[PDB]
Scaffold this active site. Structure first.
Site, short mmCIF file in Angstrom:
data_model
loop_
_atom_site.label_atom_id
_atom_site.label_comp_id
_atom_site.label_asym_id
_atom_site.label_seq_id
_atom_site.Cartn_x
_atom_site.Cartn_y
_atom_site.Cartn_z
N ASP A 1 -6.40 0.63 -7.68
CA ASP A 1 -6.37 0.98 -6.26
C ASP A 1 -7.72 1.57 -5.86
OD1 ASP A 1 -5.20 1.14 -3.75
OD2 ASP A 1 -4.07 2.97 -4.21
C1 6BQ Z 1 -6.23 2.54 2.03
O1 6BQ Z 1 -5.76 1.29 2.43
C2 6BQ Z 1 -5.74 1.02 3.81
C3 6BQ Z 1 -4.28 0.84 4.24
O2 6BQ Z 1 -3.40 1.87 3.77
C4 6BQ Z 1 -2.60 1.57 2.56
O3 6BQ Z 1 -1.67 0.58 2.88
C5 6BQ Z 1 -1.04 0.15 1.58
C6 6BQ Z 1 -0.31 -1.06 1.86
C7 6BQ Z 1 -0.36 1.34 0.91
O4 6BQ Z 1 0.01 0.91 -0.51
C8 6BQ Z 1 -1.05 0.40 -1.31
C9 6BQ Z 1 -0.92 0.69 -2.80
C10 6BQ Z 1 0.28 0.10 -3.32
C11 6BQ Z 1 0.49 0.39 -4.79
O5 6BQ Z 1 1.38 0.66 -2.71
C12 6BQ Z 1 0.23 -1.34 -3.07
O6 6BQ Z 1 1.49 -1.98 -3.50
C13 6BQ Z 1 1.64 -2.97 -4.50
O7 6BQ Z 1 0.46 -3.58 -5.03
C14 6BQ Z 1 2.99 -3.37 -5.04
C15 6BQ Z 1 3.85 -2.23 -5.58
C16 6BQ Z 1 5.34 -2.58 -5.62
C17 6BQ Z 1 3.27 -1.70 -6.92
C18 6BQ Z 1 0.03 -1.67 -1.62
C19 6BQ Z 1 -0.16 -3.13 -1.31
O8 6BQ Z 1 -1.12 -0.98 -1.12
C20 6BQ Z 1 -1.10 2.59 0.94
N1 6BQ Z 1 -0.16 3.73 0.84
C21 6BQ Z 1 1.02 3.81 1.71
C22 6BQ Z 1 0.14 4.05 -0.54
C23 6BQ Z 1 -1.88 2.83 2.18
O9 6BQ Z 1 -2.89 3.74 2.05
P1 6BQ Z 1 -2.74 5.25 2.61
O10 6BQ Z 1 -1.43 5.77 2.03
O11 6BQ Z 1 -3.88 6.08 2.10
O12 6BQ Z 1 -2.74 5.27 4.14
C24 6BQ Z 1 -4.11 0.74 5.82
C25 6BQ Z 1 -2.67 0.32 6.18
C26 6BQ Z 1 -2.01 -0.82 5.44
O13 6BQ Z 1 -2.80 -1.92 5.05
C27 6BQ Z 1 -4.47 2.03 6.55
C28 6BQ Z 1 -4.17 1.97 8.07
C29 6BQ Z 1 -4.44 3.33 8.69
C30 6BQ Z 1 -4.92 0.84 8.82
O14 6BQ Z 1 -4.74 0.92 10.22
C31 6BQ Z 1 -6.41 0.81 8.55
C32 6BQ Z 1 -7.12 -0.44 8.06
C33 6BQ Z 1 -8.51 -0.39 7.82
C34 6BQ Z 1 -9.32 -1.64 7.61
C35 6BQ Z 1 -10.62 -1.64 7.06
C36 6BQ Z 1 -10.63 -1.81 5.53
C37 6BQ Z 1 -12.05 -1.76 5.01
O15 6BQ Z 1 -9.80 -0.82 4.92
C38 6BQ Z 1 -9.04 -1.08 3.77
O16 6BQ Z 1 -9.00 -2.17 3.22
C39 6BQ Z 1 -8.03 0.03 3.43
C40 6BQ Z 1 -6.62 -0.20 4.01
O17 6BQ Z 1 -6.05 -1.33 3.45
C41 6BQ Z 1 -5.99 -2.57 4.11
C42 6BQ Z 1 -5.47 -3.78 3.41
O18 6BQ Z 1 -6.42 -2.66 5.39
CA CA Z 2 -1.16 6.38 -5.70
#
Ligand code: 6BQ
Ligand code: CA
Ligand code: GDP
Ligand code: MG
Length: 297
Positions: A198
């Site tokens: 992650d």
């Molecule tokens: C830290 O990542 C964030 C996301 O936030 C994460 O959205 C995930 C889906 C959660 O989960 C993670 C880890 C995981 C293990 O849960 C994984 O799950 C799996 O692989 C399967 C599982 C059964 C093992 C899953 C796919 O991604 C994380 N939280 C709830 C944990 C959460 O971070 P946050 O809490 O810090 O906010 C995002 C929401 C969901 O996409 C934040 C939001 C404010 C959104 O408006 C902001 C987007 C910003 C875009 C720009 C880009 C450069 O920035 C990133 O690339 C980071 C971004 O990711 C994505 C794909 O855009």
């Molecule tokens: Ca974690």
């Protein structure tokens, strides 16, 4: 009230804090993070559990942290000096996160210019990942991490894709793209390694020169395709950032193969698998809709 509780739980674990420095982080489905100085002025991070079975649910993660703390020299990871069912605590790492998610905007507050990333950021991240991915996890007596050979990593992705398709469906063109990637022998790496799982800006600690000095939040650590730890660099910094990271990693001796960049791009296109799985296990509505859109159904 909450502050009083922190002081008492810390006291029970022989940790004595400056009350005036106690700060609560947001949220917490699993753990509430709390920041505070001890009486010598050392910064600590405390994790207050919100769910049962803390030790079984952290066992694997602690194994990964133990490997990193034993073998790594060029980066820090949390070292849980206090580790009980009631409290996990570690001394705060050096540096600051490269960016921290602010939920009232839906994006990072960045400490670097994403339009002009310092070259040292990609160079030092490549050094760190190359070091991490070569840690000899086989030398531990017990290892309960998920461990994939190169063939098993490919089969894992194939099986995970089928399971998501069975539950959500997948758009036809997207599914075909995924299958073409799965079926291309030359794409796939011939070595796996210990990954963080992650890596993103919020978990990547940098010094004032944007040199990576540490990583936090090791819950997704496993031994598998190293390519996962490159994905955020691509997503945030585009192909140029991906190339810069690959170059640094290659040149310091990380495992490289000719289609590495292409493979990482295909893995990024498979990100919908991961968001779908998280939607399923978490039950959170917002991630359910994000999953459906990502799967193109
Ligand atoms: C830290 O990542 C964030 C996301 O936030 C994460 O959205 C995930 C889906 C959660 O989960 C993670 C880890 C995981 C293990 O849960 C994984 O799950 C799996 O692989 C399967 C599982 C059964 C093992 C899953 C796919 O991604 C994380 N939280 C709830 C944990 C959460 O971070 P946050 O809490 O810090 O906010 C995002 C929401 C969901 O996409 C934040 C939001 C404010 C959104 O408006 C902001 C987007 C910003 C875009 C720009 C880009 C450069 O920035 C990133 O690339 C980071 C971004 O990711 C994505 C794909 O855009
Ligand atoms: Ca974690
Ligand atoms: N600067 C710094 N921030 C930390 C450290 N440990 C945790 N944090 C912050 O606390 C947040 C939550 O910690 P994390 O281990 O990711 O737990 P999570 O809430 O379960 O994802 C992180 O996103 C960081 O902002 C640390 O050593 N240094
Ligand atoms: Mg985190």
């Amino acid at each position: 009230k909450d502050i009083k509780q922190v002081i008492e739980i810390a006291k029970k674990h022989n940790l004595f804090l400056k009350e005036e420095t106690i700060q609560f982080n947001e949220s917490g489905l699993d753990f509430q993070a709390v920041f505070a100085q001890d009486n010598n002025g050392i910064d600590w991070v405390l994790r207050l559990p919100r769910r049962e079975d803390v030790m079984p649910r952290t066992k694997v993660e602690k194994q990964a942290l133990d490997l990193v703390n034993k073998y790594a020299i060029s980066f820090q990871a949390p070292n849980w000096i206090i580790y009980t069912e009631e409290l996990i605590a570690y001394k705060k790492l050096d540096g600051v996160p490269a960016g921290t998610i602010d939920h009232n905007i839906g994006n990072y507050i960045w400490e670097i210019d994403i339009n002009n990333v310092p070259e040292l950021f990609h160079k030092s991240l490549g050094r760190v990942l190359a070091e991490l991915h070569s840690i000899p996890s086989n030398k531990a007596a017990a290892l309960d991490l998920v461990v994939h050979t190169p063939e098993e990593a490919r089969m894992s992705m194939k099986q995970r894709m089928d399971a998501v398709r069975a539950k959500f469906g997948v758009g036809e063109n997207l599914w075909n793209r995924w299958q073409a990637w799965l079926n291309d022998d030359d794409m796939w790496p011939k070595k796996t390694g210990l990954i963080h799982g992650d890596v993103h800006a919020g978990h990547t600690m940098i010094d004032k020169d944007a040199n990576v000095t540490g990583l936090i939040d090791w819950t997704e650590a496993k031994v598998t395709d190293v390519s996962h730890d490159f994905i955020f660099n691509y997503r945030a910094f585009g192909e140029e950032g991906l190339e810069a990271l690959i170059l640094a990693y290659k040149e310091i001796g990380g495992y490289y193969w000719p289609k590495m960049k292409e493979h990482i791009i295909e893995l990024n296109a498979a990100y919908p698998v991961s968001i779908a799985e998280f939607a399923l296990v978490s039950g959170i509505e917002e991630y359910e809709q994000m999953a459906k859109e990502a799967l193109e159904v």
